[PDB]
Amino acid sequence: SLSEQLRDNYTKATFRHMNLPEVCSSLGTDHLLSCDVSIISKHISQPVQEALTIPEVFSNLNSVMCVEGETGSGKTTFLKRIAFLWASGCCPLLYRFQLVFYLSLSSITPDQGLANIICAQLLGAGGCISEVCLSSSIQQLQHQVLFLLDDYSGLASLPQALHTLITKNYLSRTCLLIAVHTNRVRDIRLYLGTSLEIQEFPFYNTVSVLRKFFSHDIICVEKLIIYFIDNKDLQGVYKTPLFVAAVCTDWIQNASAQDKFQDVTLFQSYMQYLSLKYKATAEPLQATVSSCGQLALTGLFSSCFEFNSDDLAEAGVDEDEKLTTLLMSKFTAQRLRPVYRFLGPLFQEFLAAVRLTELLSSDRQEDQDLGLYYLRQIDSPLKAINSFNIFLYYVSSHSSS
Amino acid sequence: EEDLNVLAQNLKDLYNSPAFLNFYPLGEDIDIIFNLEKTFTEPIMWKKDHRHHRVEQLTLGSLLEALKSPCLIEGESGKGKSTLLQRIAMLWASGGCRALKGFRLVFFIHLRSARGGLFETLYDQLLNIPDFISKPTFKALLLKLHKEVLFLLDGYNEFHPQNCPEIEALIKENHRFKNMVIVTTTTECLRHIRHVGALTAEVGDMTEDSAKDLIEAVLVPDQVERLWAQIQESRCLRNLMKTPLFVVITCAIQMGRQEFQAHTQTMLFQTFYDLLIQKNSHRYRGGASGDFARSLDYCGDLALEGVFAHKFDFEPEHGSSMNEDVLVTIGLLCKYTAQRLKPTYKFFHKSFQEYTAGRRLSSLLTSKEPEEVSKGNSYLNKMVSISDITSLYGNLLLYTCGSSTEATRAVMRHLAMVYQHGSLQGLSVTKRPLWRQESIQSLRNTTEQDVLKAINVNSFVECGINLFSESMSKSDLSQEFEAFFQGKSLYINSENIPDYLFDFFEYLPNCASALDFVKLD
Amino acid sequence: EEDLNVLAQNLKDLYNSPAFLNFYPLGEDIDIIFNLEKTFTEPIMWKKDHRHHRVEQLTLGSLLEALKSPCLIEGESGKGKSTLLQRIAMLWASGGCRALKGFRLVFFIHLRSARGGLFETLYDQLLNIPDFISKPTFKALLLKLHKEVLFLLDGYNEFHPQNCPEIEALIKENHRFKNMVIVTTTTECLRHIRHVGALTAEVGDMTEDSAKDLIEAVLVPDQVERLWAQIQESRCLRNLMKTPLFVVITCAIQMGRQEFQAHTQTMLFQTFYDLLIQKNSHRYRGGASGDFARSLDYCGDLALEGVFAHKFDFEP
Structure with a gap:
């Protein structure tokens, strides 16, 4: 009867809601009204194993598993996807999965188990059934229990039954999922069989979202697809499919792109969303913008892209601000000194354009001597057409003069 | 038996855990692949004896076939033989051998972190013991079964008997247990256990x-x-x-x-050296009493005094073996409390000691103290015969020049001047591509020893070009190397030419402009 | 009898232990081969008398055939006759002799490290005594059997009677025990025991x-x-x-x-000399009252004054 109560509760209809139409707030879901991504399934001893799909996750399920992506975006969309479409039952293994458990651990470290967070962020966890007797209901029907665990990266050993469940994952013969970023895959790696990577397919996903949500205006969609072969590296900038809401506000909330559709308006609007999302003062949020801007100055300085993690004199401290901001990350497996990676290698040049207007219309002590310094390191006119076309066309935004 | 059936059932099925099957093969700091399915190979072993003789080359299964409790297994430094032991318990959880199938109780503990009583320490890493299985039921069960009981005990390098005297009693006083026990450790404190146990074997x-x-x-x-x-x-x-x-x-x-x-081999020794500094930074707490760099200086001085005076065994007097046992406790060299009056201290590899004197030598050429740099020039002053530099000092100055750019210039100042040949009658050519020995070759020069002088000079140039190639100071000291090989010849077999010659003509072709000739085969 | 059958069974089968069969023949400092299977030979012995006469050249088995409790065995310095005694108990665990087969209780203790009561000191090196075998069951069992009881007692050079007066009572007052006891020591404090015991023999x-x-x-x-x-x-x-x-x-x-x-013979005497300095550095605590090198000077002055004046007995 506990399984009947929780089965009746986990089919929640208002559970569908996502801020992917944040201020646009279009009347629609994100599965029947939005497309999907795929799985880069990677083995632990470095073969890139397969690229499975979402029912292919269901075929050979993993008893404990980690995925990488973007929080707020696809990973929690994948977990709430599993629960909300688990309230549907169409796949020929569905309706026979027993107890999923959605959990985001970025808020809490509440040194207490199931009744704390099921009674806290959800309805309740039962009082006649004890919290360990609820854990006994876990550990008496283990074989079909599915977990949707999120963000060990903001978690320590402080929750008791949680962290002792994760460190003793045999003692519940269950399926465990977790959605930690690529900064802290190493703490999950002791308890992994395979790694899963979320990756956008910007061949079709961006034109599916901008198709379905913007059938109101389709001539600029013609501008988009003709722009896809005038600029054949359009896949080289569309690197996260659920942070295209800045593009969504840059069609319905900023109609200027309808007559000005090239790249710098688009990811200028993405950068403006990065100012709007996590709206704050001149903290090292802003010095993470400028300091990763001079990480981008080191990026195009000696044409180094996958970094060395030696010279953190540019940005350095409070890595939670730079990965939470998500302008960079680091390497997963062993290196001698591990290697930083970007969401987009050419997007880094737009970060250096933000660095260039920061080094163009600000304090004139030595800052514009740094922008003047690298701006004089690029002093050849035949390089100027192509390199100054792309990079200085990224500079063609930000009109401060 | 139902207690043993349920608990031993969940332990038979418990030992396929991914944490039990994977770890970090360089300690705990870096995310590194391990897999008993893949990383495990079959290592060689040797059945020991009272003469410490490598009697029988034991494999894993042959060691299982030759069971003598207490099974004493020893090996080298930093091995991580929990690969072996967790392979044994994992194949016990997977049906590995018939002799493995005959067991019922298989355990495994890190002695480096074991603490509390035996019921509690095994409860510290299993946690699945209810009140219904009591501690007299536990220990009286272990003594009760008495034949199918098996323990895998690892990590005696950091075992402390005050954490659990019962485990140390299980090591020594087996007569009050008489259960099948397996102890795996290094030679750091092997003398404390060796006389008690019966089986002794090493990992080769x-x-x-x-x-x-x-x-x-x-x-x-x-x-x-x-x-x-x-x-x-x-x-x-x-x-x-x-x-x-x-x-x-x-x-x-x-x-x-x-x-x-670019990691030719000198960066490999630098990565191994500093990587063992990383793994043993605070594993053994580095230098606990007396700091870490002092013991590093002690190891490097053992390398200089050893290699320069041609000494490769190391048996200091009793009482003065403090920093010796500090560095063995870290894991620099292998100590030997084996069948010898005073205990033996030597490096696991001879040219690795030569690397220790190399980076020690460049380190004493590094600082601004004139006594250590000019004293390093006095270490250079132990080389006046150019043939003995090729026979002994070749890998030393090879690692020294390859380890840092600063020591290269001092090697240029000293070896740019040294020209005296030295021994040739005791240093005739062992292997050569000169397989044709005619009398017309004796009619070129009747003095065969002058041809051996040409072999000494040409092999000295082999040490020079191999030195510059391993140095990777690819475009810096061009006037010095060009001023080096002037008045020097070059013998090349055309039938075996590696690519560092291409790097030699590539990087500094002016050195080839300043040569004398090439005798080309 | 079931207590004696189980406990004496595990002691009959307990005495083939590799620690019981191997030790360091130069003390405790250096990893040195020992093996009762190999290192043991047959040493010569002499049946003593009141005139201290070497009457009968006793072997091991002939000493077993000539049993007189208390068996007093003495010999030279630094011998380590636990080779002999552990050979006796080991062949008792292996079926050595018929006279050995006639026994039921065979024990052996280091008197140099024995401490606590007799039940507790034998519990200090066996540890396999449950509560069901009590101390009056223990000592009343030992006095109860009275003929098949046998003790191997070694290390009186560093025995201290305050550690166990019951063991010293087992040495001296055998009449309150009348169990078969064997005492092995050197001539350092042989005068304290010799008059009590009956059998006396030396290792030649x-x-x-x-x-x-x-x-x-x-x-x-x-x-x-x-x-x-x-x-x-x-x-x-x-x-x-x-x-x-x-x-x-x-x-x-x-x-x-x-x-x-190169070790002709002078390095052999240097190795033996300094090796006995190593073994007796802090075994007897060296020079406890007054330092060690002073007594070394005393021994060397005994050697100079002895040899130079042609003196080789020494009765100060």
Whole structure:
């Protein structure tokens, strides 16, 4: 009867809601009204194993598993996807999965188990059934229990039954999922069989979202697809499919792109969303913008892209601000000194354009001597057409003069 | 029996855990691949004796077939034989051998972190013991079964008997237990246990085909193929394949996307050295009483005083072995409290000690103290015979120049002046491509010893170009190397030419402008 | 009897332990081979008398055939006759002799480290005594059996009676026990016990053929052959073969890989001298009251005043 109560509760209809139409707030879901991504399934001893799909996750399920992506975006969309479409039952293994458990651990470290967070962020966890007797209901029907665990990266050993469940994952013969970023895959790696990577397919996903949500205006969609072969590296900038809401506000909330559709308006609007999302003062949020801007100055300085993690004199401290901001990350497996990676290698040049207007219309002590310094390191006119076309066309935004 | 059936059932099925099957093969700091399915190969072993003789080359299964409790297993430093022991318990959870199938109780503990009572320490890493299985039921059950009981005990290098005297009693006083126990440790405190136990065996080296299985197991075949081409060039590196840890580091640096072939071998010794500094930074708390760099200076002075005076065994007097046992406690060299009056202290590899004197030598050329730099020039003053530099000091100054750019210039100042040949009658050529020995070759010069002088000078130039190639100071000291090989010849066999000659004409062709000749085969 | 059957069964089968069969023949400091299967030879013995006369050259089995409790066995310095006693208890665990087979209780203790009560001191090195076998069951059992009871007592050179007065009572007052007891010690404090006990015998020298068995037992035949060629040159070294400890050191130095033939005989006396300094550095705490080198100077002055004035007995 506990399984009947929780089965009746986990089919929640208002559970569908996502801020992917944040201020646009279009009347629609994100599965029947939005497309999907795929799985880069990677083995632990470095073969890139397969690229499975979402029912292919269901075929050979993993008893404990980690995925990488973007929080707020696809990973929690994948977990709430599993629960909300688990309230549907169409796949020929569905309706026979027993107890999923959605959990985001970025808020809490509440040194207490199931009744704390099921009674806290959800309805309740039962009082006649004890919290360990609820854990006994876990550990008496283990074989079909599915977990949707999120963000060990903001978690320590402080929750008791949680962290002792994760460190003793045999003692519940269950399926465990977790959605930690690529900064802290190493703490999950002791308890992994395979790694899963979320990756956008910007061949079709961006034109599916901008198709379905913007059938109101389709001539600029013609501008988009003709722009896809005038600029054949359009896949080289569309690197996260659920942070295209800045593009969504840059069609319905900023109609200027309808007559000005090239790249710098688009990811200028993405950068403006990065100012709007996590709206704050001149903290090292802003010095993470400028300091990763001079990480981008080191990026195009000696044409180094996958970094060395030696010279953190540019940005350095409070890595939670730079990965939470998500302008960079680091390497997963062993290196001698591990290697930083970007969401987009050419997007880094737009970060250096933000660095260039920061080094163009600000304090004139030595800052514009740094922008003047690298701006004089690029002093050849035949390089100027192509390199100054792309990079200085990224500079063609930000009109401060 | 139902207690043993349920609990032993969940322990038979418990030992396929991914944490039980995977760890970090360089300690705890770096995210590194391990897999008992893949990383495990078959290492060689040796059945020991009272004479410490390598009697029978034991494999894993042959060690299982030759069971003598207490099973004493010892080996080298930094091995991590929990690969072996967790392979044993894992194949016990998977049906490995019939002799493994005959067991019922198989345990395994880190002695480096074991604490509390035996019921509690086994409860510290199982946690699945209800109140219904009591501690007299536990220990009286272990003494009750008495034959199918088996323990895997590892980590005596950091075991402390005050954490659990019951485990130390299980080691020593087996007569009050008489259960099947297996102890695995190094030679750091092997003298404390050895006389008690019956079985004694060592883990030997690693074969090049099992190393081939390990390299081909965990990496893309391009890095395996060209890294393996670096393996099948250097004979010294083929001597270095007698331990898995170098193989882990070579499968660690080249792991990535590109041929990182700048790591010739001197960066491999630097990565191994500083990587053991990383693993043993605060594992053994480094230098607990007296700091860490002092003991580093002690190890380097053992390398200089050893190698320069041609000493490679190390038996200091009793009482003065403090920093000796500090450095063995870290894991620099192997101590030996074996069948010898005063205990033996030596490095696991001779040319590795030569690397220790190399980086020690460049380190004493590094600082601004004139006494250590000019004293390093006095270490250079132990080389006046150029043939003995090729026979002994070749890998030393090779590692010294390859380790840093600063020591290279002092090697230029000293070896630019030294010209005296030295021994040639006791240093005739052992192997040569000069397989034709005519009398017309004796009619060129009747003095064969002058031809041996030409072999001494040409092999000295081989040490010079190999020195500059391993140095990788690719475009800096061009006037000095050009002023070096003037008045020097060059013998080249055209039938075997490696690519560092291409690097030689590539980087500094003015040195080839300043040569004398090439006798070309 | 079931208590004696189970406990005495596990003690009959307990005494083949590798720690019970192997030790360090030069004390505790150096990893040195011992094996009762191999290192044990047959030493010579002498049945003593009130005139201290070497009456009958007793072997081991002939000493077993001539049982007189309390069996007093004495010998030379640094011998380590736990080879002999653990050979006796080991062959009792292996079926050595019929007279050994007639026993039921065989014990052995280091008197140099024995402490606590007798039930507790025997519990200190057995640890397999449950609560069901009580201490009046223990001692009343030992006095109860009264004929098949046998003790091997060794290490009186460092015995202290305040550690256990019951063991010293087992030595002296045998009439309140009347169990078969064997005491083995040196002549350091033999005067304290000798008048009480009945049997007295000494361990004599070592024969050159048993020494040949010991050298040929534990070493490669090259070192045995050429070291034995050094033995069959010096007649003085053939006088030095009358003790096993020199034979241990000669089978220790040449043990290795090479003919270490620089150790002619003066390095042998230096190795024996400084090796006894090593073994008796803090075994007897060296010089406890007054330092060690002062007593070294005293021994050397006894040697100079003795040898230079041609004096070789020493009765101050």
